[PDB]
Every structure is written in C-alpha cells, then in structure tokens.
Amino acid sequence: LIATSTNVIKSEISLRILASECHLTLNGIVEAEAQYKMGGLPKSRLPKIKHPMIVTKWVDYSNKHGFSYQLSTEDIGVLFNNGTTVLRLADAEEFWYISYDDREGWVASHYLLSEKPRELSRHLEVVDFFAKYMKTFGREEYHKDDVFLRRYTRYKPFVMFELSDGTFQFNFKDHHKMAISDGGKLVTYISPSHESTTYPLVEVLKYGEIPGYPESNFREKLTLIKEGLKQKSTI
Ligand SMILES: [Zn+2]
Ligand SMILES: [Zn+2]
C-alpha cells in the first residue's frame, strides 16, 4: 500500500493515540478471524449492534486552505493545514475548535457562531465555503456522541478515515464502504445506494460475505483493511 496523501500530524502524543486505535481494532479483526477459524466463544456478552458515525461526504482541494468532510450527523468538519479542526455542528449555531494539546493530544473548545472569536474569523470563512459546498467533547447530552476526523489516508484502492471515537471507515473504488467499530468487533456495510447495515464481524466471516451483497468482495476488502491498519500502526 502506497499512500498518495494523508494529513500531517505534528504531535507525537496524537500519533501514539492514533496508532493505539489502529493496533486495537486490528487485534479485534484478527481475534474475530480466530473465532471463525478455531471456534472459541468469548465469555463476554456479544457486541450490542450500534450504527457508527460515518463520513458521508468529503473533498480534498489544494487551494481552499483545508480538507473537508460531512458526517452522518450532518456536522461539517474542516481539517486545516496546520492540523487544527473546526467542527461545525449541523444546527449551524455551535462549533468546536480542535487543536493540539501536550497532555491529551487533542483539545476541543466550545463556541457559538454568533459569538465567534476574532482569532478564528478566517477559519469560519473557510468553514462557510465548505458548508455551501456540502449543501474530547465533554459529557453534555448534546455533545456526548460528538466525533471528528483525526486522520485520513488516500490509497489507490481505498481512502481510510480514522474517527475520534475509534471507528475506522474505508471507502473503496467500487463505492462499497465499510466501517469497523467497537475495537474491530463490528462491521458496518454501506452499499453503493447508501443502505447501511451493521453486523458482528465474526458473523460475517462465518457467512463468508456481506448479507445481501455478494458482489462486495468482502474477503479482499478485509485484507486491504488489515494492511491499512497494520501500516498506520507503525507511525
Ligand atoms: Zn497490544
Ligand atoms: Zn453545545
């Protein structure tokens, strides 16, 4: 696998955290494969099926001062070239400014668009551009499921998204998408018509393919996924 591009992470602590999640779900995938091959049944209660956060839209321009994406919450993020992020909530009133922190890797600050700080004014002009184009977070109820994009990597066969809740999303050339969550225990298949279905990974392995989508070439995709995770874990 040869990454054509990826965002630059300047923080060693951030890189450690990223590598840990890559390591974590790769281990999970390998364990699911071991359960399939050797038949062990974990004492642990099975993973509750929960649809993960997904990236529904993204764009990688060179001349607009950032990478941008939309999430299934309809939140819009801009990943700026210095590695900071503005995450604009779908309500079009609140946003997070996310920057580096020497203790936690990333830190997020809560703002209102109506009370925009002057030192983020140009950031929000860029965010406004991408909002037009498209059309960490505490424990408050409105924010407890908030997620942002920590790292993306573009490969020829797929683009890989690493979300802040530990979910990994893989968009393949054939417009089949797969998201791995819950430490590699759950796989979410997103069809080319955006029909979303989530399964325990071990169940898909035993079945041999994604239910309802025999053309999705699951085993090749899972191999690519493992290669992606393995590579990113070495940084
Ligand atoms: Zn380990
Ligand atoms: Zn808020």
Residue numbers in the entry: 460 to 594, 602 to 701
What did the article's authors report about this structure?
We determined the crystal structure of the polo-box domain of Cdc5 using a fragment of Cdc5 that included residues 418–705. Similar to other previously determined structures of Plk1, the extension preceding the polo-box domain (residues 418–459) was disordered in the structure, while residues Leu460-Asp705 adopted the characteristic polo-box domain fold with the first polo-box defined by the β1-β2-β3-β4-β5-β6-α2 structure elements, and the second by the β7-β8-β9-β10-β11-β12-α3-α4 structure elements. The loop connecting the two polo boxes (Ala594-Ser601) was disordered in this structure. The distance between the last ordered residue from the first polo-box (Lys593) and the first ordered residue in the second polo-box (Thr602), as well the conformation of residues Thr602-Asp611 folding back towards β5-β6 rather than reaching across the first polo-box towards α2, suggested that the loop may had been proteolytically cleaved during crystallization.
Cdc5 promotes the release of Cdc14 from the nucleolus and regulates the mitotic exit network (MEN)9,16–18 as well as cytokinesis.
